[PDB]
Amino acid sequence: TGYDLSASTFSPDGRVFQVEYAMKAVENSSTAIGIRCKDGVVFGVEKLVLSKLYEEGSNKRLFNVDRHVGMAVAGLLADARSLADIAREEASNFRSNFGYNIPLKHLADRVAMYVHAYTLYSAVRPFGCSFMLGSYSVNDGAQLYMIDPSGVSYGYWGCAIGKARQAAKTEIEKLQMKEMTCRDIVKEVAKIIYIVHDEVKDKAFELELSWVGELTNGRHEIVPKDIREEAEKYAKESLK
Amino acid sequence: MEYLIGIQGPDYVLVASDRVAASNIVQMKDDHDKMFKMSEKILLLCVGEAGDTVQFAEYIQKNVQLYKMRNGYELSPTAAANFTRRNLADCLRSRTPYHVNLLLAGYDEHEGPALYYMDYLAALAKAPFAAHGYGAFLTLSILDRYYTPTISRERAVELLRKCLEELQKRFILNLPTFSVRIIDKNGIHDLDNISFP
Amino acid sequence: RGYSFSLTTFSPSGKLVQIEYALAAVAGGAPSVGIKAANGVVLATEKKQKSILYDERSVHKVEPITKHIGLVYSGMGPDYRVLVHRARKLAQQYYLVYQEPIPTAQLVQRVASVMQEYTQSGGVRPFGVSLLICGWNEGRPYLFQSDPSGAYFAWKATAMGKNYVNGKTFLEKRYNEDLELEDAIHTAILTLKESFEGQMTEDNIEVGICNEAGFRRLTPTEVKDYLAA
Amino acid sequence: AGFDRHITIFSPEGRLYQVEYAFKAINQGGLTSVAVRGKDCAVIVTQKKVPDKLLDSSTVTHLFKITENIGCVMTGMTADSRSQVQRARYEAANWKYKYGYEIPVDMLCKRIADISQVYTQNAEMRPLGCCMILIGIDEEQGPQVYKCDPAGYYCGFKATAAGVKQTESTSFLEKKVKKKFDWTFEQTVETAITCLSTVLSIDFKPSEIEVGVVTVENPKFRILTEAEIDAHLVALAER
Amino acid sequence: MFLTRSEYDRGVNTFSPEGRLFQVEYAIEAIKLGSTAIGIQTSEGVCLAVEKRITSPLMEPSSIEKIVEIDAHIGCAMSGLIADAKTLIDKARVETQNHWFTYNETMTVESVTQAVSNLALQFGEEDADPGAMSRPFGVALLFGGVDEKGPQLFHMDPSGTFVQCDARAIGSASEGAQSSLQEVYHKSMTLKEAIKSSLIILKQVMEEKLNATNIELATVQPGQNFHMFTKEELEEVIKDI
Amino acid sequence: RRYDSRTTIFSPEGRLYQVEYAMEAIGHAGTCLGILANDGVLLAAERRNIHKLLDEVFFSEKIYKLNEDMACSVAGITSDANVLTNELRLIAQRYLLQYQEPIPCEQLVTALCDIKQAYTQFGGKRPFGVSLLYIGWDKHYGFQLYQSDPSGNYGGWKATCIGNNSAAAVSMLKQDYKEGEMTLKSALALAIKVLNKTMDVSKLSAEKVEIATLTRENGKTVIRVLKQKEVEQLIKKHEEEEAKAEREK
Amino acid sequence: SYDRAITVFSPDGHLFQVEYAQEAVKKGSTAVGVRGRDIVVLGVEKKSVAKLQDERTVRKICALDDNVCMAFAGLTADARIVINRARVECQSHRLTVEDPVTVEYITRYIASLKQRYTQSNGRRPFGISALIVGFDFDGTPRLYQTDPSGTYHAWKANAIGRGAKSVREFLEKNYTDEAIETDDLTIKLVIKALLEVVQSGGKNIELAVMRRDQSLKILNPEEIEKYVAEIEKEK
Amino acid sequence: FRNQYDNDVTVWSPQGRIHQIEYAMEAVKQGSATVGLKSKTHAVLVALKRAQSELAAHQKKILHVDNHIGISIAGLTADARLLCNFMRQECLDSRFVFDRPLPVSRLVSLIGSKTQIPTQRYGRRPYGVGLLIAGYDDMGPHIFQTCPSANYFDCRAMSIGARSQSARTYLERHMSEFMECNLNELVKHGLRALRETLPAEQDLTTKNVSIGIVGKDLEFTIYDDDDVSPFLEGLEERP
C-alpha cells in the first residue's frame, strides 16, 4: 500500500497516514504536562538524563517564545527548536506591526497554520513535534494551548504530551485546577510527573518546571531552585 | 567632425571617408579606416561618438557574417540596412544609445546598386547620393549641382574629388587624406586614396 | 504500463493516453446538445439534481462569455468554471485591444490554446471537460466544440456526455440545415429526451439560444412552454 | 492500479479517485453538520463533541465568522478547516477593499471553491479534506445557504447536511421541504435540531450542539448561547 | 549466501544503512578506470608522471594532456574523467589568478587544492545554483608545487577531501603501485632518484612497454617553474633506466 | 527493461524511443501530400473528419498559410499543430520586422525544427507529435517543398506524402512523377491519382479532400484553395481518364 | 539499474548514458578526416538520394567560419544546433578579441557545450561526434575530434560513425608522410578510405577540402567522379 | 520488508521514526574518534587522526572557527568543511556587527537550525557529520556536540566517533576530578580517554594525536604533531 508514503496522498478510506505516523513521533518523547489555574499556567517536563556526561540545564524542552509566553515541547527536538524560532518570529512581527504583545490564541493559530502548511505538500514532511504554549495577561487571563503535528489547536485547562499522556491526563483530571493557585500547582505537577515516570524503563529524570502568571507579573520564567527542591521533595514523599 | 560621402550610379556605388581619428586637438591617427565590409558586396561607413562607432559596426558586421555562414547566401543591402536600423532604433530608447551616423552602400544582383542613409535617431532613407558630418553641408551642393543619375564611374571619382577639394578649400578641420572604394557586381574594389597634400 | 500514468509520455503506437482518459471523463458527464439553426443556435443540457434541496438558481451549466457568445459543457464542473472565467477574461482582453466583440472562432481558438497549455506540463492534469461554444457573429451562427486535448471542431449539430453517440445519430437523422431555431429547440429537447432516464421538467434541463440579439438563457417558464409540446 | 495516489492522473474511466477519497476524509471525523434555510433566517447546526474534560469547551468550535454578516460551519479535518476559514476571511476582506461592498455569500463560496479546484488540478498539494457551508443574508435574494466541497462544486441549497449522517439527514430534510408550508425562525431552528437529533439518535443536551443563525432582522452572524440552545431544545421536547 | 539488494546506491543524497553514501564511493572507484598517475615529493622538488594510454597511432600524442600547469608554481596530474578534470583545472587556474589579482602573491598548493575541493564538494547541492553538477566529480588530482613551505604534493579525490602525501599513486594500478612507492620511497631521495623510481613503477604497471610517447612527465623545482620533460629528455631518462 | 520514457534517456543501441513513438502517431493521421512543379507547388490532403454534422467554416482544416509566400499542411496532433503554426507565423513576422524582407522558406522550417529538437532534448516536455509539409516560393531557390518530423529533422522533397498510407503514396509518386516535366495541372492529376489509391473510399468525395496551390502571378505569390467545383472537375477528369485506360484493355 | 540517469555512477564508476550516446554516434553515416601538409580533407558518406529528395538540404559538412569547418556523425538535429551555436561563438569570439578563432578554441567550446549537457539530468547528451578541421594562424593543419562525452583529441587522421573501426584500421595501414605529400593524394586517400565502407563510390560520398587561405570547397560530383576514376584505374 | 519508509527524509515511518536521519547518525560512527572535556578555566579537544597510507599525512580533525571557538569533526569531511565555513562567517558577522565574540551557545543554535532544514525538506541530505564544539566565552568554558540530527547538547565531556563508548565510560568514571584540573592534567585525561578507543595494538603517537585548547587567556590553538609531545610524554602506558 503506497498510500502511507506521502502526506499529499489520501488513503482510500479518507485518512492521511503520514500525519498519524508523525503523531506517533511525540509518544516516543518523555512526558510533559502543563496545567492552568486561576493565577497562571505552570509547565513541567520530565527530562530524562541520558548520560551523566551531559550538563545540567541542557536539552531544555521549555523555551521562552516571548517575554509573556512560554513553550513546552514533545517530539523531535530539532523540529521543536525550529518551531520555537518560528513562534518567536511571529511574536516579534506581531509586536512590530500591531504594537503590543501577541495574544496567545492568535500565536497558537499562526504557528498551527505554519505547521498545517507542511501536511499538505508532498515535498516536505509534517513536523515531528507536539508542543504546549502558555501565557498570562491581565486582560486575556491564563491561557494554555496545545498544537499537534497536524496543526490542530485547542485550549486546555490541563494538558499532557508524550509517552505517558493518558496516565498523566487522568492524574491531572483528578486535580480541580480552576480554584487552585500556582505555588500549589507546581507541587502537584511534580507529583504527576514523578508518578508517570517509569523507573525501570527510564533510568533517571531531572524535573524541569516553568510557569507564567501574576506572580511573575506576566513573564514566563524558570522556577527558582528553592521552589523546585520543595516540589521535588513533596513529590518524592507523596510517591511512597 | 568626420566626413562620409556616397554616390550611387547606374551599376556602382562610390563611397569615401576621411582617414582622421582625433583627440581634442591632436589628430592621433592619420590612416583610420571608417569602412567596414559586412559582406562581399556591402560596406558600412560609420561616424559618430567614439567607441559607439566601432562597437556598433563590429556588431552588425558579425551578425551579417553569421547570416552568411548559417544560410549560405549574403543578406541583401536593403535587408542589412533595415537590420542595422532596427538595432540602432531599439538602443535609442534604451540607456545605451549608440550616437552613430551611418552610410550603407551595397550592390544586389537583383536590385542593383543601393546607397542607404541613417542618422543617430535611426531614420532610414535610400538616396542617390548622401553625406554625413559637418563637411556634408559644404559638399552636398556640389553633388546636387553636378550629379546625374547616369554618371559614369570616372565622372563620379572626378565629382568626388571636386567635393573633397571644396572641404580642403573651406572646411575648418583638416581632413588631408580620404579613402575611396567602389562596390559593383564584382564586389568591393579599393581605389587610390584621394590625397590632397 | 508507464504510458498510462504519465501525461508527457507517448505510449507505444503513439497515444497520449491520459488525454483519452480525460475524454472518457467527458463522456461520463451529463448530456449536452448543440444545434446550429439558420437564424440561431441552441445549447441544451440536463441539469438533473440529486434532490429537491438543491436550489436551481444558484448555479448554471450554461454561461455567457460575452453578449453574443455562450457555452455549455459536459464533464467536470470545476474545470468548466476555471475556463469560463478565463474565456470571459480573454474576450475582455480582445475588446480592450481591438474595441470589437471577439469572434466566436477566435475565442474557441484561445480557450483551446489554454487547454493545450495545460496538457504539456506534468505537474498539471488536463481539463476533464469539453465545451460547446456557440456564437453569432457577422450575421451568421456558429457552433464549436473544444475537447480536453486542446483541439476544436465546428459542428452543425452535435452532442456530448452520456449516450453522445446515440444522440448524434438521432440528430443526423433529424437535422435539416433549413431549420429555424423555433424548431431547433424542439429537436434539441428531443435529442436530450432520448437519454434522460427520467421525466424531464423545466428545472431538470437548462437551455440557451443565440441569435442576432445575442446569447440568452430562456427562463424556466419559457422552457416549460417549449416542453408542453 | 496506481491510478489513485496522485490527484493529477485520470483513471481509465476518468474519475480522479483522490478527490473522492478527500470526500471520505470528511466522514472520518465522525461529526455531522446541518444547514436549513427559512423565509427570513438561515441556521447552521453541528455536533460539538469534547473528547476530554480538560479541553476548554469555549475553544473547540466548528462555527466561524468569515465576516460580520457571513458565518460558516466546517466539517472535516480541523486544521484544513481552520486554514480554509482563514483564506475565506482574507478573500472577504480583500473583496471589500477592492470593490467597496461586502462580499456576497455566493461569490465567497465561488472563490473558495475555485481555490479548491486549483488544489485538485496541481500535483504537489492535496485537496483540503474539509467541507464548508456558508450562511448569510443578501438584500436582493434574502437568506442564502451554500456549500463548498473538496472538488470545487459550490452549489447553493435550500437545506443541506455534511458529515457521516449526510444521506440520512438529507433524506429527512427532503421530506420536510416536500411538505412545504413555511419556515419562520423558530421552525427553522427546530427543523435543524430535529434533523440532527433524529439521524444521530442523540436526543441532545445544550452542550452537545452549537448553533449559529442569521436573520433579515439582525443580519450579523451570531452563535447562540447555551441558554438559547436549551430554550429551543426544551420547546422541542414539550411539543 | 548472497545479499545483493543494495537499493540505496542509486541517487546521491541518500544515506544507506550504516550511513555510507555509496554514490561518492562509486565515484572513488571510478578513478581506477583512469590511467595510472604517480607523484613523489622530495626536497629538491616534486615530480609527476602518468601513462597516456594512446588508443591508436593516428591520435596526436601531444593532445593527451594528463599533466597540466595551474600556474608556474603549481602543476597538476589527473586520472579519471578528462572532462570534469578540465572543469576542476579551470577552477584552479582562475582561483590562482584571482589570488594574484587580490593579494599580489602566489597561492600555496594547499590553498589551491582547497579551492578546487570546495567546488568538488558542491555535488551535495547545498547551494541553490543550477550550474553545479549533481554527480560527484569522477576524477582524482595530484597537486604538486613549490610554496613557502617548499616542495609539496597534495592529493584530491572525488569526495573533495585532500591531504599532503610524500608519494601517491592514483588510477588503475594505484593498488600495488602504492606498495612499490612505500618500499622505494625515502625522504632523502633526490628528484633524479624519484624520477627513476616513479618511471620504474609506471613501467611495471603499464601493459605496454614504456616509451617516450606513452608517458608524460613533469617536475617543479624551487628555482625552476613547472616543466614538462620533452621528447629528448624523456628519451634520455627512459634510456637511463 | 524500459528505456522508453522521459524522452531524455538514450537506450542501449543509442535510440530515443519517445520520438520514435511520436513518429508512430503521425502515421495514424490523415494523409497529406505535396508535389513540386515547374510553375507552382501544391498541397493536397485528405479531410479525415468526414462526420456528416461538421461545418467547413474555416479556410482549411489541414492547410494553413504561414506567410504571404508560403503555406503548410499538418499531420499529427491538432493541438500541437496549432501551437506550431502560431509559432511559425510569429517567426516569419519577426524576420519581416527585422530585415523587412519575407522569411526564407528553409529558414522558417529550420527555426521550427529547432523548436521541435529542443522539446526532444529537455526533460519535462514531450516531443511534438506532428509532421507537416511546407510549400513556398523564395527569391533564392524559387519554389520549394519541405517536410518535417517530430525529431526536428527536415528535408527538401520534389514530392512526398505524410500520414496514413504514406509508403503507398511515395511508391506511386516515384513511378509517376516526372522530374523537370510537371506542370500544376499534371501535378493536380497525379495528386488525385495517389489520393484515390491511398484513401480507402472508392470515390474521392470532393468533400473528403482539400487541395491548395501556390503560384507566382504578377510578381506576387498567391495561395489558393481549389473550390469544390474545381476538385469535382478534377476527380471527374481522373475517373474518365482511368476508365478510358480501362476501356482500351 | 544504473543506466537510467546520467548523474548516477554505476558500481565500478561507469556513466552509462553517455556511453549509450557514444553508441548512438556509431549508427550515423561515416565521416573521415585527414591532415595533408597544406590541405585538410573532410569526407562524408551520403545515405541515399531517394529520387524525390533535394540533395542541397542535407549536407553533413558545414563551415563554422572562414577558417574552420566540421563534419558530424550522429543525430542530425543535434548537429544542426551545435553547428549554429559554434558559429555564433565564432563570430562572438571575433567580436570580443578582434581575431579569428583557432581550431582548438572552437573544438573546446563545442566540447564544453556537450559536457554541459552531460553533467546535468533533465538534459540528454548531444548524440553527435564531430570532426573539426581548420588552419591556424601559423598555417599548420589541424584536425580535432569530439564525442558526446565532451573529451576532444587531435588526430592526424580519423573517422567517425558506422564502419569507423574498419576505415580507421585501413587508414592506420595506409596513412604516411608519402600520402600527405600531394593534395590530390590526400583527397584520393580519403576517397579510398570511404570506398572501404560504402555501397558505391561516386554517388555516395560528399567530400570537401580546405586549403591554406581559401574558403571551404565542396568538390563537384564530376571532380569526385574523376578522382574515383583515377583511384579505380590504378588498382 | 519495510524497504519503504527508508528512501527519503520526508517519509515518516509507521512508528514515528525518520530512518534517513538515523542512517545519517550512523555516519559519525564511521570516523576516527574524538574526545572533548573541560575544566573551570579551560576547554580541550583531542582527536585520533587517520591516514590513507604510510606516505600520506594524517587528516585534519580539529579546525579553528574563531579565537574563542574551535571544532573537531567526526563524520563526513565535506559536511564538516561546509558547516565550518558557515560558522566562521557567522562569527565574523557577529564581530563586524556587534564587536563582541559570538556566544558559543548561540552559534550551536545557528548550526542546529541550518542542519535541521535538510531533514524536513526533500532534496539535500542530512549533514552526516558530528561535531564537538569547544570554546570559552564570558559565561565560561563550554563544550557542545552536534549530531547529524540537528539536536545539540551541552556536555561536561563527550566523545564522538568509532569506539567512543570506551572513552565515554572512562570520562564518566573520571569526570569528578576534571573540573579542578590543570590544563596538563585535563589534556592527559582526554588523551587516555581516546587511548581507550584505539585498537590494543595501536598506541598514541605524536603523529596521530591532535590537541585543541581554548581558555580565558588562551585563544583556540591546535597543538600539532610536534607540539603534542609535551602533553603526551606524561602518559604512562596501556593498562
Numbering used by the authors:
A (entry chain F): 5 to 244
B (entry chain J): 1 to 197
C (entry chain A): 3 to 231
D (entry chain G): 7 to 245
E (entry chain D): 1 to 241
F (entry chain B): 3 to 251
G (entry chain C): 2 to 236
H (entry chain E): 2 to 240
Reproduce the article's own wording on this structure.
The proteasome plays an essential role in protein degradation and is critical to maintaining cellular protein homeostasis. The mammalian proteasome core particle, 20S, is a large, barrel-shaped protein complex composed of four stacked heptameric rings, including two inner β-rings flanked by two outer α-rings that are each formed by seven different α or β subunits. In each α-ring, the N termini of the α subunits form a gate preventing unregulated protein entry and degradation.
One-step affinity purification using an NbALFA nanobody resin yielded proteasome assemblies capped with PA28, including double-capped proteasomes. The high-quality density map of the PA28αβ–20S complex reported here revealed a composition of three α and four β subunits, different from the 4α/3β assembly observed previously. Six out of seven C termini of endogenous PA28 engaged in stable interactions with the binding pockets of the 20S α-ring. There is one low-occupancy binding site situated between the 20S α1 and α2 subunits where a phenylalanine, 20S α1 F29, may be sterically hindering the binding of the C-terminal tail of PA28β. Interestingly, the cryo-EM map of PA28αβ–20S purified by ALFA-PA28α pull-down shows additional density inside the 20S antechamber that is proximal to the bound PA28. We suspect that this additional density does not represent endogenous substrates but rather is from ALFA peptide used to elute purified complex.
